[PDB]
Amino acid sequence: GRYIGPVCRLCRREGVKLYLKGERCYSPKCAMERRPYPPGQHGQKRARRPSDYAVRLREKQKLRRIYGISERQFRNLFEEASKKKGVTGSVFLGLLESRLDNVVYRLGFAVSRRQARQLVRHGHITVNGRRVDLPSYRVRPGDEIAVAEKSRNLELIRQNLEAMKGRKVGPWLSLDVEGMKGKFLRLPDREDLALPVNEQLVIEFYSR
Amino acid sequence: PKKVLTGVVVSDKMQKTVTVLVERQFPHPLYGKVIKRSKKYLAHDPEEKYKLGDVVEIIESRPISKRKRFRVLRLVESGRMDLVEKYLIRRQNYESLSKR
Amino acid sequence: AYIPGEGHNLQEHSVVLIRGGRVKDLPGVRYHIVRGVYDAAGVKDRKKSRSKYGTKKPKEAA
Amino acid sequence: RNLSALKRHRQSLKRRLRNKAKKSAIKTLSKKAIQLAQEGKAEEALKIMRKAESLIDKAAKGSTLHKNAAARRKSRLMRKVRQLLEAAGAPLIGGGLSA
Amino acid sequence: MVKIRLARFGSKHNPHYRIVVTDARRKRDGKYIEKIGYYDPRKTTPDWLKVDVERARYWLSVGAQPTDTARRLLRQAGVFRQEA
RNA sequence: UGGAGAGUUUGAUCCUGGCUCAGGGUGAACGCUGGCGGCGUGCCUAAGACAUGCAAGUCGUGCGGGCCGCGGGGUUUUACUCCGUGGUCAGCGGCGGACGGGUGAGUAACGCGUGGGUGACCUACCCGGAAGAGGGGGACAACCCGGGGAAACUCGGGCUAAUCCCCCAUGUGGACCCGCCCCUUGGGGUGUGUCCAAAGGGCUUUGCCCGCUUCCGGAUGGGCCCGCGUCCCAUCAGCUAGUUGGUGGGGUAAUGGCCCACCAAGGCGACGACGGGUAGCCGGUCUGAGAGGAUGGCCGGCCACAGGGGCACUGAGACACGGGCCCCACUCCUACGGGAGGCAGCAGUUAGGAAUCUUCCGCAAUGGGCGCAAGCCUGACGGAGCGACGCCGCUUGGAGGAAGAAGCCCUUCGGGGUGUAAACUCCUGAACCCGGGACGAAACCCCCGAGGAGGGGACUGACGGUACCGGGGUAAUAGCGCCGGCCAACUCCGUGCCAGCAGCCGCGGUAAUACGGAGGGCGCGAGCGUUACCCGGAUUCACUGGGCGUAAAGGGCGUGUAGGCGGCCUGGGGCGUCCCAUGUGAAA
């Protein structure tokens, strides 16, 4: 099962936040600004010299950790990444981002990973005619993420869309707060979504 | 079709039938260099006409007898006393390798 | 056949599961024993190597 | 217990019967033919080679000798007569015999 | 004896038969002389049918025999039709 | 578009180098934990032996009959029989049993992958083509009479039919024989002489359907043959008298000694013969940048085996898994005179091993065998069940939430940690309740036309009311390796060369970051470690890609055979080689 629970324990773990949880872990701490640094009794007891390969492992985590998916499937779609054609690193990134759940999140329907993937597995997302649970279902150019009909009358969905209006969507993310939708336009790149993560480190690591 | 090959007549010593030292060569499926190889065949001579050396183009035909495969349809050269010599030098070497 | 260390009974049958792996001890140590098998079931109270050392799930009922 | 593979061996016993009798007659007629021809009379053994020919057809038609086989028997049988006719005899009459 | 038949491939609950000529002996999901068509009675793809009626006319004109699902296929692919 | 290294030899460096690890996989196994669902996979051992249930049947459009049934015909009526007759049981007769099917024992193989020769060949159930289907005869069942026996079944006698067996035929044609024209391995024609046919059944009958006879052509599978590649030990060096070859015979569909006879000495071998250990082979598969190494189970092709061996028979096809004969064991039934049986078919028992499952449903779909069809057998096939054995997707929750409660770990008594984690909050809503509800299957079939093409209507679900659609709604499993460097992560007590961990180096010999406990954190998470087997790192059998002054290694030195390779130049060859056309390389 996808870890869950004490989450932004992960945030402090990297030493750099990952929103992970919205409203709070986005507010004055992702467990950060309160006491930001890797957890445990140790933690704030003088950092070391973590080897290149090791901070690289950390980077691989880091990346899989912001993408609320098991390192199992992080790896899986990495194998698929090295499989077909595409700029290995940046394309691997876009391949991770092109997943239904964070599509729904970055659309602003949800306020972070946990909530996002939850709602998505709850099949509240009608893409091109059908509601799809299936969190690790990647969309295609010309498709559009929608929400169900009774789901138009949902509390924090309405609240999300309320506080969302004004917050300009991603470039490949087409907003549609009128028709209750989100056009999955082009296929984004590193300069569309920037997260404290190196692509070639994940390559070099996984591609041993 | 019907695979053929030229070949140096060895041993006329059988009646109306001679043996033929046929030859080939090919590289090495993992070691470059071309290697030379021997492989004897049955030269079929209903009207005894081939002798010590006579390189002839020889023909795989209908099963003639016990291993009696191949035949002849045309000659090329005669008096290959040098080649047959080398053949017999090899045979000398065979009669020069005792374990008893 | 060696054993998985501390906490044995074994007497003389057990079905010691011939395993495999020497060390700088007993000029052999090849083909170990396992606990759980048909005998031993690990250390009387173990909190880690319960993958050989028998003990199931320390269900301390609290 | 029950399986009509008994049908097999029954009818097959009958078929073996067929083969036995007919094929046997074939062999023997061939032999009388070569006997008479070896002597130096022919004519009777050529009417017996006639009867023989018909018989080897009886072989060909059935499951005894199959087509080409019966043909081969015919051939060899007819062949041996001719040469061993000339041998001290004189081939006068002809049936399966060609001039 | 050479007959035209069907060889289903795929998985467990996603049928799709290969419309294919072969000889009598050849087992089902086995070997074939030549393949000419496809048919999936499931109907999930508009391409649920294809018949290479050319080589079909070959086989029919050169001494072979059909099947039953074939009968349907032949009467539904102009394999039978003689125009006029 | 494809290449990461590291520890360990010293006081210290460097080099050669061995060991070990990080890694990837598997038909797995083992322990620890274990929720949902999809597609796969599942005796890897004893080719050890098996209870029982099923797996090869089908046909009245070949034929006679038993006998159950019915209108009931005949007999004036009678005993009862007897015409039509659904049936129903076998028989004679006809087609599959040589496919479907499993294992891997043998087999180092013209077996297999592979490219062709067959002027050395076979091919039924099928599409075309041609000549057709005159007449007669005999015999055995099933049945009726008697016997043996526990059965198995076995013996004799007496009859009827036939698409059962023959007989002179009719003879486009096919077969041989001796010649002859063309060829060129036995390819095709042709002059003489002899042999062969046929089965008929149905009915809307004067015509057709189903089958039959004689040949030719294809469709299709195989037979034989060569070319070619094909594990290891040289401490396996010589092997062979059916042996090498022929003539002449015998046999097969047929080439050939495969076998008879007679005969001339040859036939293979360091290009590894002979021997023996080992082994099914492949399209493929895992790993490595690649060269390659290893591998061949599910699947698809070729082989081989039927408890071991011999062996024929039947036939289009076999030396035939659920046909026959015999020897060998081996087990079982009996009244101990006698007799039976083969789960390397399919479920299931047992021996075996660390380990490899249900004694299930339906011929609805496809496919095979048979029948004019209706239809029938099908443990082929098509479906559920069981096992985290493999891969895939997936819930245990979201969101507010403390200078952060307490519970427990740590302390320099200030606190630090655990952890927004918890609790309190609202939100949704697995599991689960009601309702409806599938695709998988439209052909076959009767009907108009002609039985053709075409047209119409109607029958046909094992899964299962499962999938899925709609609504009602519960927060609703968490583990496994580790924290001494390779390898990411330390603090506290105990234990004191003891108990012990360890793949490598090693670590503890009374303040252990390696044992063992407890908090925390590294990894992974419906899974994790362990071992085993395989490829890599191993460039550590080096072709890419190594070496022999002292680390492992020049043969004590000259000789010479074969073999290996080779100076300048002209031209011919076009073998190696290079180029494009092109056949095949199936499918997956």
Coordinates of N, CA and C in Angstrom, one line a residue, chain D:
Chain D
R1 N -13.6 -52.4 -19.8 CA -14.1 -53.7 -20.2 C -14.6 -53.8 -21.6
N2 N -15.4 -52.8 -22.0 CA -16.0 -52.8 -23.4 C -15.3 -51.8 -24.3
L3 N -14.8 -52.3 -25.4 CA -14.3 -51.5 -26.5 C -14.2 -52.2 -27.8
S4 N -14.9 -51.6 -28.8 CA -15.0 -52.3 -30.1 C -13.7 -52.3 -30.9
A5 N -12.6 -52.5 -30.2 CA -11.3 -52.7 -30.9 C -11.2 -54.2 -31.1
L6 N -12.2 -55.0 -30.7 CA -12.4 -56.4 -30.9 C -12.9 -56.5 -32.4
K7 N -13.6 -55.5 -32.8 CA -14.1 -55.4 -34.2 C -12.8 -55.4 -35.1
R8 N -11.9 -54.6 -34.7 CA -10.6 -54.5 -35.3 C -10.0 -55.9 -35.6
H9 N -9.6 -56.6 -34.6 CA -9.0 -57.9 -34.7 C -9.9 -59.0 -35.4
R10 N -11.2 -58.9 -35.2 CA -12.1 -59.8 -35.9 C -12.0 -59.7 -37.5
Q11 N -12.4 -58.5 -37.9 CA -12.5 -58.2 -39.4 C -11.0 -58.4 -39.9
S12 N -10.1 -57.9 -39.1 CA -8.7 -58.1 -39.5 C -8.2 -59.5 -39.7
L13 N -8.7 -60.4 -38.8 CA -8.4 -61.8 -39.0 C -8.9 -62.3 -40.3
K14 N -10.2 -61.8 -40.7 CA -10.7 -62.2 -42.0 C -9.8 -61.6 -43.2
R15 N -9.3 -60.4 -43.0 CA -8.5 -59.8 -44.0 C -7.2 -60.5 -44.2
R16 N -6.5 -60.8 -43.1 CA -5.3 -61.6 -43.1 C -5.6 -62.9 -43.9
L17 N -6.7 -63.5 -43.6 CA -7.2 -64.7 -44.3 C -7.1 -64.5 -45.8
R18 N -7.8 -63.4 -46.3 CA -7.7 -63.0 -47.7 C -6.3 -63.0 -48.2
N19 N -5.5 -62.1 -47.6 CA -4.1 -62.0 -48.0 C -3.4 -63.3 -48.1
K20 N -3.4 -64.1 -47.1 CA -2.8 -65.4 -47.0 C -3.1 -66.2 -48.2
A21 N -4.4 -66.6 -48.4 CA -4.8 -67.4 -49.5 C -4.4 -66.9 -50.8
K22 N -4.8 -65.7 -51.1 CA -4.6 -65.1 -52.5 C -3.1 -65.0 -52.8
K23 N -2.4 -64.3 -52.0 CA -0.9 -64.1 -52.2 C -0.2 -65.4 -52.3
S24 N -0.6 -66.4 -51.5 CA 0.0 -67.7 -51.6 C -0.2 -68.3 -53.0
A25 N -1.4 -68.3 -53.5 CA -1.8 -68.7 -54.8 C -0.9 -68.0 -55.9
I26 N -0.7 -66.7 -55.7 CA 0.2 -65.9 -56.6 C 1.6 -66.5 -56.6
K27 N 2.2 -66.7 -55.5 CA 3.6 -67.2 -55.4 C 3.7 -68.6 -56.1
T28 N 2.8 -69.5 -55.8 CA 2.8 -70.8 -56.3 C 2.7 -70.9 -57.8
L29 N 1.7 -70.1 -58.4 CA 1.5 -70.0 -59.8 C 2.7 -69.5 -60.5
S30 N 3.3 -68.5 -60.0 CA 4.6 -68.0 -60.4 C 5.7 -69.1 -60.5
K31 N 5.7 -69.9 -59.4 CA 6.7 -71.0 -59.4 C 6.5 -72.2 -60.4
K32 N 5.2 -72.5 -60.6 CA 4.9 -73.5 -61.6 C 5.3 -73.0 -63.0
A33 N 5.0 -71.7 -63.2 CA 5.4 -71.1 -64.5 C 6.9 -71.2 -64.7
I34 N 7.7 -70.8 -63.8 CA 9.1 -70.9 -64.0 C 9.6 -72.3 -64.1
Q35 N 8.9 -73.3 -63.5 CA 9.3 -74.7 -63.6 C 9.1 -75.1 -65.1
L36 N 7.9 -75.0 -65.6 CA 7.6 -75.4 -66.9 C 8.4 -74.7 -68.0
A37 N 8.6 -73.4 -67.8 CA 9.5 -72.6 -68.7 C 11.0 -73.0 -68.6
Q38 N 11.4 -73.4 -67.4 CA 12.8 -73.8 -67.2 C 13.0 -75.1 -68.0
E39 N 12.1 -76.0 -68.0 CA 12.1 -77.2 -68.8 C 12.4 -76.9 -70.3
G40 N 11.4 -76.3 -70.9 CA 11.5 -76.0 -72.4 C 10.3 -76.3 -73.1
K41 N 9.1 -76.0 -72.5 CA 7.8 -76.2 -73.1 C 7.1 -74.8 -73.4
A42 N 7.1 -74.0 -72.3 CA 6.5 -72.7 -72.4 C 5.0 -72.6 -72.5
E43 N 4.4 -72.9 -73.6 CA 2.9 -72.7 -73.9 C 2.0 -72.9 -72.7
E44 N 2.1 -74.0 -72.0 CA 1.3 -74.2 -70.8 C 1.6 -73.2 -69.8
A45 N 2.9 -72.9 -69.6 CA 3.3 -71.9 -68.6 C 3.1 -70.5 -69.0
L46 N 2.6 -70.3 -70.2 CA 2.3 -69.0 -70.7 C 0.8 -68.8 -70.6
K47 N 0.0 -69.9 -70.6 CA -1.4 -69.8 -70.2 C -1.5 -69.7 -68.6
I48 N -0.4 -70.2 -68.0 CA -0.3 -70.2 -66.5 C 0.3 -68.8 -66.2
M49 N 1.0 -68.2 -67.1 CA 1.4 -66.8 -67.0 C 0.3 -65.9 -67.3
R50 N -0.7 -66.4 -68.0 CA -2.0 -65.6 -68.3 C -2.7 -65.6 -67.0
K51 N -3.0 -66.8 -66.5 CA -3.7 -67.0 -65.2 C -2.9 -66.2 -64.1
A52 N -1.6 -66.3 -64.2 CA -0.8 -65.5 -63.3 C -1.0 -64.0 -63.4
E53 N -1.0 -63.5 -64.6 CA -1.3 -62.1 -64.8 C -2.6 -61.7 -64.2
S54 N -3.7 -62.4 -64.5 CA -5.0 -62.2 -63.9 C -4.9 -62.1 -62.4
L55 N -4.2 -63.1 -61.8 CA -4.0 -63.2 -60.4 C -3.2 -62.0 -59.8
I56 N -2.2 -61.5 -60.4 CA -1.4 -60.4 -59.9 C -2.3 -59.2 -60.0
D57 N -3.3 -59.2 -61.0 CA -4.3 -58.1 -60.9 C -5.1 -58.2 -59.7
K58 N -5.5 -59.5 -59.4 CA -6.3 -59.7 -58.2 C -5.6 -59.2 -56.9
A59 N -4.2 -59.2 -57.0 CA -3.4 -58.6 -56.0 C -3.5 -57.1 -56.0
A60 N -3.3 -56.5 -57.2 CA -3.3 -55.1 -57.4 C -4.6 -54.4 -56.9
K61 N -5.7 -55.0 -57.3 CA -7.0 -54.4 -56.9 C -7.3 -54.4 -55.4
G62 N -6.9 -55.5 -54.8 CA -7.1 -55.6 -53.3 C -6.2 -54.9 -52.5
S63 N -6.2 -55.2 -51.2 CA -5.3 -54.6 -50.2 C -4.0 -55.4 -50.0
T64 N -3.9 -56.5 -50.8 CA -2.8 -57.4 -50.8 C -1.5 -56.7 -51.3
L65 N -1.2 -56.8 -52.5 CA -0.2 -56.1 -53.2 C -0.8 -54.8 -53.7
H66 N -0.3 -53.6 -53.3 CA -0.8 -52.3 -53.7 C -0.2 -51.9 -55.0
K67 N -1.1 -51.6 -56.0 CA -0.7 -51.1 -57.4 C 0.7 -51.4 -57.9
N68 N 1.7 -50.5 -57.6 CA 3.0 -50.5 -58.0 C 3.8 -51.8 -57.7
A69 N 3.4 -52.4 -56.5 CA 4.0 -53.6 -56.0 C 3.6 -54.8 -57.0
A70 N 2.3 -54.9 -57.2 CA 1.8 -55.9 -58.1 C 2.4 -55.8 -59.4
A71 N 2.5 -54.5 -59.9 CA 3.2 -54.2 -61.1 C 4.6 -54.8 -61.2
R72 N 5.4 -54.6 -60.1 CA 6.8 -55.0 -60.0 C 6.8 -56.6 -60.1
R73 N 6.0 -57.2 -59.4 CA 5.9 -58.7 -59.4 C 5.6 -59.2 -60.9
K74 N 4.6 -58.6 -61.5 CA 4.3 -58.9 -62.9 C 5.5 -58.8 -63.7
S75 N 6.1 -57.6 -63.7 CA 7.3 -57.3 -64.5 C 8.4 -58.4 -64.3
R76 N 8.9 -58.6 -63.1 CA 10.0 -59.5 -62.9 C 9.7 -60.9 -63.4
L77 N 8.4 -61.3 -63.0 CA 7.9 -62.6 -63.4 C 8.0 -62.8 -64.9
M78 N 7.5 -61.9 -65.6 CA 7.5 -61.9 -67.1 C 8.9 -61.9 -67.7
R79 N 9.7 -61.1 -67.0 CA 11.1 -61.0 -67.5 C 11.8 -62.3 -67.4
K80 N 11.7 -63.0 -66.3 CA 12.5 -64.2 -66.1 C 12.2 -65.3 -67.1
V81 N 10.9 -65.4 -67.5 CA 10.4 -66.4 -68.5 C 11.2 -66.3 -69.8
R82 N 11.1 -65.1 -70.4 CA 11.7 -64.9 -71.7 C 13.1 -65.4 -71.9
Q83 N 14.0 -65.0 -71.0 CA 15.4 -65.4 -71.1 C 15.5 -66.9 -70.9
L84 N 14.8 -67.4 -69.9 CA 14.9 -68.8 -69.7 C 14.0 -69.7 -70.6
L85 N 13.4 -69.0 -71.6 CA 12.8 -69.7 -72.7 C 13.9 -69.9 -73.7
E86 N 14.6 -68.9 -74.1 CA 15.6 -69.0 -75.1 C 16.6 -70.0 -74.7
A87 N 17.0 -70.1 -73.4 CA 17.9 -71.1 -72.9 C 17.3 -72.5 -73.2
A88 N 17.8 -73.0 -74.4 CA 17.5 -74.4 -74.8 C 16.0 -74.6 -75.4
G89 N 15.2 -73.6 -75.2 CA 13.8 -73.7 -75.7 C 13.7 -72.7 -76.9
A90 N 12.4 -72.6 -77.3 CA 12.1 -71.7 -78.5 C 10.7 -71.1 -78.3
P91 N 10.7 -69.8 -77.9 CA 9.4 -69.1 -77.6 C 8.5 -69.0 -78.8
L92 N 7.5 -69.9 -78.8 CA 6.6 -70.0 -80.0 C 5.3 -69.2 -79.7
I93 N 4.6 -69.6 -78.7 CA 3.3 -68.9 -78.4 C 3.5 -67.7 -77.5
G94 N 2.6 -66.8 -77.5 CA 2.7 -65.6 -76.7 C 1.4 -65.0 -76.2
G95 N 1.4 -64.7 -74.9 CA 0.2 -64.0 -74.3 C 0.7 -62.7 -73.7
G96 N 1.3 -62.9 -72.5 CA 2.1 -61.8 -71.9 C 3.4 -61.7 -72.5
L97 N 3.7 -62.6 -73.5 CA 4.9 -62.6 -74.2 C 4.8 -61.7 -75.5
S98 N 5.8 -60.9 -75.7 CA 5.9 -60.0 -76.8 C 6.9 -60.5 -77.8
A99 N 6.6 -60.4 -79.1 CA 7.6 -60.8 -80.1 C 8.6 -59.7 -80.3

